Design a binder for this molecule. Structure first.
Ligand SMILES: [Mn+2]
Ligand SMILES: [Mn+2]
Ligand SMILES: [Zn+2]
Ligand SMILES: [Zn+2]
Lengths: 117, 33, 225, 107, 1419, 84
């Protein structure tokens, strides 16, 4: 569903199940992150920890975390409870040493069935 | 819709007047439902 | 040959989209390819080294550690070689802060004020979405390093340049945020109009309609920016 | 015709139009390594006598400006040593009629 | 008009000469002097004052008195006033130009600062474009600020040559609204010469400097000695427009009235007077200056309202304003508003619907629309009753009329008129009737890119709304019936009627110029139906024959005697269709396996209007070249053909209606097994792809030369997956039965191609965006449903399924991706094509074929010395076989050799009557030898032209047909000997050629031109009417033969282009229309290319050379390589593995092991300790056929001695160049290292980056004569350098081609430029299979080339491209366009359509390209 | 500028545009009851009569063909071969 010609591909339509994130406070997460072993960036030394996965949150580099998957689990599990807002988006880029969390409104998202082992 | 009106609402702020050196404040068209 | 754009803006307060570009000068094989960032209000592209110094990260070794999280990555560090040189003239935070101050200021202005101008720019304009308060200079240095990083990691044919058309990195602005843009820009005139009821009062004078008309106006047309 | 290898001093260039009406034409060796007129797309250019020229512009009743044009510096013109005002009959193989003959006046 | 008489000849403006009013003329023509800035009330005595609104100028007060020119407010053409300006003044329009001229001439002697002595100036001066010259001169002269005294001559710089002996410095002149300010200097910053002196260059200074510019100097600027002198740009003397330009709204009597120009002039006059009343009274300087700049302001504002403000104080304290620029803002924009087609009158628009029951040239007009549009018909004894009947019928009954217009031009409004039913129509009144059945109306569908989309039809009033079109008139209009509206326009005058129905009438448009074929065919149902009706298995019971028969109105009532009379009287499907066909129609065509028994009921033979064999489908009955419509049109007339569409449709449609044709999902299902073959075919490619994957993941795929692994892996995969879809698609097309409704449409020709069946039934095939498989949008994977780095077809976007089978979500989304690509640039192709077509027209708009068969533009320039090189009209050309060109020399002799002196190669006494007495006739065999040597030159000539060997070339007069008509018109029997003499043929044809006349001039040049224009048609003719041919094959008797000759001559003349032909527009819309169908190996093709080409873009997207190897070595794959390498730009960068700067201080021993052996080796039969060491890669090192020595002594000859070079030799396992500078060293080296890796040219021509070899199959004559394909290696290059590549040893420098027609021009000249440009434009038009008759592109390519250079089409000028100052008034500033036209003496030819509309005249185009006059001769 | 009856280089044949325009001009006359030259063997419609006049070589008009240089040839509709 795009209108032909001039607006073509520029005017788009939400697939039935897209909603748009409403925008959530990242305070409690950033709070949880350093509670969960995120190293503060102030206290960060790379030649010392280059295996460090860097946690971003709404774009802000908040620091670092060795052993992210154990952060990632929790982050996922929290959101899957309700304790972190469902709309909150967390992407770990394993091969980039990055874990970017997103809480800002405007992110178009859709629902999926969780397949977990 | 019929009356060509605006489905707004009274935006009432709450002011603290203090000498230093309810209150109606605008209308917000309410989005239906 | 490359550019590393952030478009940092505060989620709340007053949305200031103050773009920071981190530009790699020269194309592959132009003699001494230097990196410079482009700070807002600062009418000249500052060698990135000098920013780190103005950010309190003085010694090369330290600066490079903020950029190049890998001591063996001799290729990247070798890319920066001319940066370290490009910021050679400047060796302490104040000279650095001054260097910037001067590219943001007229020739008349006094060193302290100059430094102070560069101190406020780095604190409020440079990467404002990190922190706008004080103690967070390492927080920016690090982010700025990471920018220079990614920029070079792209320059070293080690990274694909960002897909402009990836949707995850788009946002859809809706009823909520739109009515908040105007409502910010209209409450700011209501906060301004009420200010012309103090400077102007020597001895209930509130335009309801500035906002009623303003929202109502925008929504009756499609007039936002 | 002065043929030369790499180039000439633009000073020695300003030495060319100097011995009138005698024309000095200058060909960089490289421009001559191949005869362009032997090229496929290059048709027979035939410098017309001012007498054939008179006939042309008459038979057809054309002011010189109404003829198709060729540049003084056009590689075929230069090769022919075309002097401005000189017309060339261009006999070209046509796919419509066998030959078609068009004229260009040196500009 | 103005029923009075004037003895003065009645004429039409043929030319408009634009110029500037010299102050001299401004007085000379003027009637007043105009002093008083007021009007009326002369001490109260009303009327006018000798100052304004009267002194001699136009009258008011209903008074006829007006310099004795009488007449009054409606008949007088207001006479012009005069007003002396106290001081010179810049005319606003030219302030720009004035300044600009002032920068070119010296400001003291009036001497062009740059002469014929300066070399960059003779190129500036030689330019013929008065506008472009002036610009080129100015950009050259504004540098100058010193009017040089002595100039370096054409000799020694020692030797100065004198010129204008005035040495003074010029100011740099800047503008300030109305004042030009000049600032001097005795050089820029030199001692005792600093600080400029700003002084305002006054009008009085400039005017006098302008006067000092020579007739020679200012003519080398735009200016005209006679029409526009620079001085005249400066007003001294102001024209005063009279009362018709500036009215006076006197509300009956006793009230003020004078227009807003009158007041604006009144204030000029005021300032003028107060400027005089300060010189006459004497005054200070900044008082007269102030009084000057007030005047200058008011003259300025008078013409242009866009300066330092707006003086709006004219009788109103509220302040509005009107100038003469801002008068044209309602008169350049009210003329342009009516120049853009807004007030659309006598036209009507509605949905179109198809209607198989209208004739081909009808348009069903709904009654209600018919009742709305009128035709003014003059009451005439021939029509008095009908008209009277209408007038009674009235505005509401159909065959009625809206208005009866009597002598006096009164309009009785039959609708609201107390005499509606009581009007005695008198002769000579106009009744404005409704359009009724058979009125020619012009029916057009926008966007109308195509003479064929504005055609004239006969009206046929019909019931319901919507226009109704005959289906076959459908594609000429590119119209369908899914909502298209069309405009109908009623020609209003009788000649305007005549023109429509005589030129644009739909029948006259069947064979169209655009592709020398019919452009209207039988279509959709009628096509599908006709094929069916035509099959052998189609037979018609008597009961239904009679209807079908009766349906054809042109039926003669004879029931054809059935082709089966046995058990059941039973007609062929062919037989009855054959009654739609008129007599005298023959058609032979042969397909792949047609015989005269055509098994497959293949091919086509129709004889005397009975299709003898062949299924009738698109080929025959469609719009195709040879087809039955082409034939019937040429053979029997356009109208009789047009009627044929009717018959055929009616018959076939009637037939189809009772037969029935459908299409279901069943038609789109494959044979159970075919589906397994298809599924197998696909799954057979997914291995291929998979194998190449494994192959490449292993790293075993070798990159094809100048193509990356990843680049060439995809390339393979894509082809596999296509070979698949395609072999898959064929697998279903072969299956589908001859019942298959889908295939049943496909056989017949109506909508439906292979790709369609292919995608519906077999594989949908590979999707693709930007000509690649679907790209990894997510990181290294196309959807979040695949794993990372999945390069399989399924992942990267092969739609495996048919549409019948349905698409998987991925397939669905990838299809959606490809789809969106399609629509996105279907919107691009529409938008760019839309505008190209509008540029292409504007470019060629004015080219017309004049009476001399020359083809010229508006100026009169010869573009083509004969239209499309042969003087033929493209709608009268057919593809024809030049037989002389083809087959073995052996064969050539067999057909054409008649040798009487040879019992073997003589004409056998059976062919010929006098056949025996011919044997051994020396004298004859000298004629027949003439014939044959001539046929031989011919074959030779032809092989020189069509190097290709292409036998079949669009030529006029179908000679094959004429002969086929002779053989039928005379019932020639191929049994008895012909009564021809050899002398009859041989001389007859020789005599015929002397009669084919495109050109008629009695002189030699024309007779030579004529001989050429006819050359090609003559070889066809000679090869067709060869003596053996005429007798052996044709068997023509003297009668039929004499007929064939006179027919060939008849048609040939009929084939000659008519003077009048807007051949250019034709040519532009012949190139445009098809481009408005281009909706789509790696070179830019189609509209980007077309917009690239027409644009003459020097910065092409895909610059390529195509070089051919020298004749003797074409096959040598190794020499193709050896050239490739010696051409492909090969840098050090491409051959070096790594560079390293070592500190290696001892130039003997070395801290590098692998180099100890190499310094030793360079000591057998200054230097820095810093070493630049390059490690080179053999792979690319020997690949580019390169030596260490060669790489080495290259660098060593690049860096003179400034570098000490040494290199490992070609045996050593590691290849190494070690280099030292010969201390700031480590930095000079990283520079040199770069100057090496980037700059140094090891091998090749610069700019040639990739160089691919390819085998090209080439058509070349073998020794025995016939055309044999000879494969050749052909290098194709990414990058163009045609000059340096042309010269490379071992290429065929004769054939080397680039698509950059620009470099071709620059290297090979303009004529070759044009040749190439035509090959490019044509490649664009050929790439979409489309055809456009050569002459159209020729004319485009000629127009681009006429002026010595490649002049772009896609606008070059901001004003023009070939447009008179009057024509479609462009910019909101036509004033500006006109101002320049004044200054440059623009000479308008009035060959425009607009200029002449502006003038109330018809264009000298086509029907207006000659004059009609009343003959005093006719007895 | 005029070119003598001999030395006419222009087609002896009437051009489709000329016919279009004679027929036009001629019909425009026939339509305003100006007198017809042929026998109206039935016809009521102007153009059809104009065509009949052309057909029977009875149109009394001269066509003035202008050459691009300005000179012109005159032909009499009578002279002009109508073969289109
Ligand atoms: Mn359609
Ligand atoms: Mn449509
Ligand atoms: Zn008058
Ligand atoms: Zn001078």
């Amino acid at each position: 569903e795009t209108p032909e010609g001039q607006a073509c591909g520029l005017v788009k339509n939400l697939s039935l199940m897209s909603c748009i994130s409403v925008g959530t406070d990242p305070m409690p997460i950033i709070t949880f992150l350093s509670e969960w072993g995120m190293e503060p960036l102030e206290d960060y030394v790379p030649h010392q920890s280059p295996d460090a996965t860097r946690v971003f949150v709404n774009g802000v580099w908040h620091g670092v975390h060795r052993n992210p998957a154990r952060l990632m689990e929790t982050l996922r599990t929290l959101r899957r409870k309700g304790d972190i807002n469902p709309e909150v988006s967390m992407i770990r880029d394993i091969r980039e040493k990055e874990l970017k969390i997103f809480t800002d409104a405007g992110r178009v998202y859709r629902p999926l069935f969780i397949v977990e082992d | 819709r019929l009356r060509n009106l605006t489905y707004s609402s009274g935006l009432f702020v709450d002011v603290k007047k203090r000498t230093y050196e309810k209150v109606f404040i605008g209308r917000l068209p309410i989005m239906l439902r | 040959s490359h550019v590393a754009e952030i478009r940092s803006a505060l989620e709340k307060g007053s949305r200031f989209i103050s773009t920071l570009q981190v530009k790699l000068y020269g194309r592959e094989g132009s003699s001494a390819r230097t990196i410079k960032a482009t700070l807002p209000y600062i009418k000249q592209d500052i060698p990135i080294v000098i920013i780190f110094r103005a950010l309190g990260i003085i010694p090369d070794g330290e600066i490079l550690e903020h950029i190049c999280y890998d001591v063996n990555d001799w290729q990247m560090l070798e890319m920066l070689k001319p940066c370290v040189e490009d910021g050679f003239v400047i060796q302490d935070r104040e000279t650095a802060l001054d260097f910037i101050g001067r590219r943001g200021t007229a020739l008349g202005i006094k060193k302290e004020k100059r430094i102070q101008y560069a101190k406020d720019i780095l604190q409020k304009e440079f990467l404002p979405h990190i922190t706008q308060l004080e103690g967070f200079e390492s927080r920016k240095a690090f982010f700025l390093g990471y920018m220079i990083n990614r920029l070079l990691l792209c320059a070293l044919d080690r990274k694909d340049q960002d897909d402009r058309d990836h949707f995850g990195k788009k946002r859809l602005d809706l009823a909520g945020p739109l009515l908040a843009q105007l409502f910010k820009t209209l409450f700011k005139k209501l906060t301004k109009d009420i200010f012309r009821y103090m400077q102007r009062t020597v001895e209930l004078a509130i335009n309801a309609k500035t906002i009623t008309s303003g929202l109502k106006y925008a929504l009756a047309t499609g007039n936002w920016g | 015709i002065f043929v030369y290898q790499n180039n000439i001093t633009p000073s020695a260039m300003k030495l060319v139009p100097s011995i009138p009406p005698a024309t000095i034409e200058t060909f960089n060796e490289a421009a001559l390594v191949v005869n362009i007129t032997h090229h496929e797309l290059v048709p027979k250019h035939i410098r017309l006598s001012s007498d054939e020229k008179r006939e042309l512009l008459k038979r057809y009743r054309l002011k010189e400006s109404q003829l198709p044009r060729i540049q003084r510096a056009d590689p075929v013109a230069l090769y022919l040593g075309l002097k401005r005002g000189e017309v060339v009959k261009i006999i070209r193989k046509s796919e419509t009629s066998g030959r078609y003959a068009s004229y260009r006046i040196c500009m | 008009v103005g029923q009075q008489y004037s003895s003065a000849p009645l004429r039409t403006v043929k030319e408009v000469q634009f110029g500037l009013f010299s102050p001299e003329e401004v007085r000379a023509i003027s009637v007043a002097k105009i002093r008083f800035p007021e009007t009326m009330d002369e001490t109260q005595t009303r009327a006018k004052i000798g100052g304004l609104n009267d002194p001699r100028l136009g009258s008011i007060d209903r008074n006829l008195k007006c310099q004795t020119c009488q007449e009054g407010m409606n008949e007088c053409p207001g006479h012009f006033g005069h007003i002396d300006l106290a001081k010179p003044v810049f005319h606003v329009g030219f302030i720009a130009k004035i300044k600009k001229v002032c920068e070119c001439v010296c400001m003291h002697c009036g001497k062009l600062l740059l002469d014929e002595h300066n070399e960059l100036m003779r190129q500036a001066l030689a330019i013929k474009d008065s506008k472009k010259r002036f610009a080129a001169i100015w950009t050259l002269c504004k540098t100058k600020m010193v009017c040089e005294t002595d100039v370096p001559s054409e000799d020694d710089p020692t030797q100065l040559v004198s010129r204008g002996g005035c040495g003074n410095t010029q100011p740099t002149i800047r503008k300030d609204g109305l004042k030009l300010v000049g600032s001097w200097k005795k050089d820029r910053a030199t001692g005792d010469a600093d600080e400029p002196e700003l002084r305002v260059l006054s009008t009085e200074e400039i005017l006098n400097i302008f006067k000092h510019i020579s007739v020679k100097d200012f003519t080398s600027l735009g200016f005209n000695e006679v029409f526009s002198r620079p001085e005249w740009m400066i007003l001294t003397c102001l024209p005063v427009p009279p009362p018709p330009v500036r009215p006076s709204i006197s509300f009956n009597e006793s009230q003020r009235g004078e227009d807003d120009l009158t007041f604006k002039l009144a204030d000029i006059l005021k300032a003028n007077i107060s400027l005089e009343t300060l010189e006459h009274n004497g005054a200070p300087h900044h008082a007269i200056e102030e009084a000057e700049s007030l005047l200058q302001f008011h003259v300025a504002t008078y013409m242009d309202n866009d300066i330092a403000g707006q003086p709006q104080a004219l009788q109103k304290s509220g302040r509005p304003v009107k100038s003469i620029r801002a008068r044209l803002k309602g008169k350049e924009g009210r003329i342009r508003g009516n120049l853009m087609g807004k007030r659309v009158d006598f036209s009507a628009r509605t949905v179109i619907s198809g209607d198989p029951n209208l004739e081909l040239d009808q348009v069903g007009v709904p009654k209600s629309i018919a009742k709305t549009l009128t035709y003014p018909e003059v009451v005439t004894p021939y029509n008095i009753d009908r008209l009277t009947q209408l007038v009674r019928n009235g505005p509401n009954e159909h065959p009625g009329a809206k208005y009866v217009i009597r002598d006096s031009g009164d309009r009785i409004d039959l609708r609201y008129s107390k005499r509606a039913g009581d009007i005695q129509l008198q002769y000579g009144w106009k009744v404005e009737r409704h359009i009724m059945d058979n009125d020619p109306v012009l029916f057009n569908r926008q966007p109308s890119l195509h003479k064929m989309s504005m055609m004239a039809h006969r009206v046929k009033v019909i019931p319901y709304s919507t226009f109704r079109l005959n289906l076959s008139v459908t594609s000429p209009y590119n119209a369908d019936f899914d909502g298209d509206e069309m405009n109908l326009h009623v020609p209003q005058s009788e000649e305007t009627r005549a023109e429509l129905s005589q030129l644009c009438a739909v029948p006259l448009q069947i064979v169209s110029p655009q592709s020398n074929k019919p452009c209207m065919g039988i279509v959709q149902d009628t096509l599908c139906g006709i094929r069916k009706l035509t099959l052998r298995d189609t037979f018609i019971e008597l009961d239904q024959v009679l209807n079908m028969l009766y349906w054809v109105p042109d039926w003669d009532g004879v029931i054809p005697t059935p082709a089966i009379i046995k058990p059941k009287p039973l007609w062929s499907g062919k037989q009855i269709l054959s009654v739609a066909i008129p007599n005298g129609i023959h058609l032979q065509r042969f397909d792949e396996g047609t015989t005269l028994l055509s098994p497959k009921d293949n091919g086509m033979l129709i004889i005397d209007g009975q299709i003898i064999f062949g299924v009738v489908e698109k080929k025959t009955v469609g719009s195709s070249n040879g087809g039955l419509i082409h034939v019937v049109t040429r053979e029997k007339g356009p109208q009789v053909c047009a009627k044929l569409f009717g018959n055929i449709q009616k018959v076939v449609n009637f037939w189809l209606l009772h037969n029935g044709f459908s299409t279901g999902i069943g038609d789109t299902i494959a044979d159970g097994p075919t589906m397994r073959e298809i599924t197998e075919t696909i799954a057979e490619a997914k291995k291929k792809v998979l194998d190449v994957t494994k192959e490449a993941q292993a790293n075993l795929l070798t990159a094809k030369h100048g193509m990356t692994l990843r680049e060439s892996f995809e390339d393979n995969v894509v082809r596999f997956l296509n070979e698949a879809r395609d072999k898959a698609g064929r697998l279903a097309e072969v299956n589908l039965k001859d019942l298959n409704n889908v295939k049943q449409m496909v056989m017949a020709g109506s909508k439906g191609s292979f790709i369609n069946i292919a995608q519906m039934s077999a594989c949908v095939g590979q999707q693709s965006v930007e000509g690649k498989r679907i790209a990894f949008g997510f990181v290294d994977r196309t959807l979040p449903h695949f794993s990372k780095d999945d390069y399989s077809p399924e992942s990267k976007g092969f739609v495996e399924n048919s549409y019948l089978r349905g698409l998987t979500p991925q397939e669905f989304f990838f299809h959606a991706m490809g789809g969106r690509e399609g629509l996105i640039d279907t919107a691009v192709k529409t938008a760019e094509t839309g505008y190209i077509q509008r540029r292409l027209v504007k470019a060629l708009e004015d080219i017309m074929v004049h009476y001399d068969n020359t083809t010229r533009n508006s100026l009169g320039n010869v573009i083509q010395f004969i239209y499309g090189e042969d003087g033929m009209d493209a709608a009268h050309i057919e593809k024809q076989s030049l037989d002389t060109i083809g087959g073995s020399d052996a064969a050539f002799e067999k057909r054409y050799r008649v040798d009487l002196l040879n019992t073997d190669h003589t004409l056998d006494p059976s062919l010929l009557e006098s056949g025996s007495e011919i044997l051994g006739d020396l004298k004859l065999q000298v004629l027949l030898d003439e014939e044959y040597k001539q046929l031989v030159k011919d074959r030779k000539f032809l092989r020189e032209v069509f190097v290709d060997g292409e036998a079949n070339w669009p030529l006029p007069v179908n000679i094959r047909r004429i002969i086929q008509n002779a053989q039928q018109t005379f019932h020639i029997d191929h049994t008895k000997p012909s009564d021809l003499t050899i002398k009859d043929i041989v001389l007859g044809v020789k005599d015929l050629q002397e009669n084919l006349l495109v050109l008629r001039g009695k002189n030699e040049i024309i007779q030579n031109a004529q001989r050429d224009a006819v050359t090609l048609f003559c070889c066809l003719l000679r090869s067709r009417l060869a003596t053996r041919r005429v007798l052996q094959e044709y068997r023509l008797t003297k009668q039929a033969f004499d007929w064939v000759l006179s027919n060939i001559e008849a048609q040939f003349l009929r084939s000659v282009v008519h003077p009048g032909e807007m051949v250019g527009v034709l040519a532009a819309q012949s190139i445009g229309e098809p481009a408005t169908q281009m909706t789509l190996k790696k070179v830019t093709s189609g509209v980007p290319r077309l917009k690239e080409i027409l644009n003459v873009a020097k910065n092409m997207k895909t610059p390529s050379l195509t070089v051919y190897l020298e004749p003797g070595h074409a096959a040598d794959q190794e020499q193709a390589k050896l050239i490739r390498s010696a051409i492909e730009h090969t840098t050090l960068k491409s051959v070096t593995i790594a560079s390293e700067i070592y500190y290696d201080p001892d130039p003997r021993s070395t801290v590098i092991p692998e180099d100890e052996e190499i310094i030793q080796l360079h000591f057998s039969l200054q230097q820095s300790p810093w070493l630049l060491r390059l490690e080179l890669d053999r792979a690319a090192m020997n690949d580019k056929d390169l030596t260490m020595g060669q790489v080495g002594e290259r660098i060593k000859q690049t860096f003179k001695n400034d570098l000490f070079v040494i290199w490992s030799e070609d045996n050593d396992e590691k290849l190494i160049i070690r280099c030292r500078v010969v201390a700031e060293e480590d930095h000079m080296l990283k520079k040199i290292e770069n100057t090496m890796l980037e700059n140094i040219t090891l091998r090749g021509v610069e700019n040639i980056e990739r160089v691919v070899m390819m085998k090209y199959d080439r058509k070349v004559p073998s020794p025995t004569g016939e055309y044999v394909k000879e494969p050749e290696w052909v290098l194709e290059t990414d990058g163009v350098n045609l000059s340096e590549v042309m010269t490379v040893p071992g290429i065929d420098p004769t054939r080397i081609y680039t698509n950059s027609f620009i470099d071709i021009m620059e290297v090979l000249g303009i004529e070759a430029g044009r040749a190439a440009l035509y090959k490019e434009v044509y490649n664009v038009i050929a790439s979409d299979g489309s055809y456009v008759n050569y002459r159209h592109m020729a004319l485009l390519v000629d127009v681009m080339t006429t002026q010595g250079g490649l002049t772009s089409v896609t606008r070059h000028g901001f004003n023009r491209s070939n447009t008179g100052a009057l024509m479609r008034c462009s910019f909101e500033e036509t004033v500006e366009i006109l101002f320049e036209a004044g200054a440059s003496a623009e000479l308008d030819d009035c060959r425009g359509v607009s200029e002449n509309v502006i003038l109330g005249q018809m264009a000298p185009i086509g029907t207006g390209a000659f004059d009609v006059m009343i003959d005093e001769e006719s007895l | 500028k005029a070119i003598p009856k001999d030395q006419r280089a222009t087609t002896p044949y009437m051009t489709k545009y000329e016919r279009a325009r004679i027929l036009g001009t001629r019909a425009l006359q026939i339509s305003m009851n100006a007198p017809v030259f042929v026998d109206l063997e039935g016809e009521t419609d102007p153009l059809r009569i104009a065509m009949k006049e052309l057909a029977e070589k009875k149109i009394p008009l001269v066509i003035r063909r202008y050459l691009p240089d300005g000179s012109f040839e005159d032909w009499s509709v009578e002279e002009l071969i109508v073969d289109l």
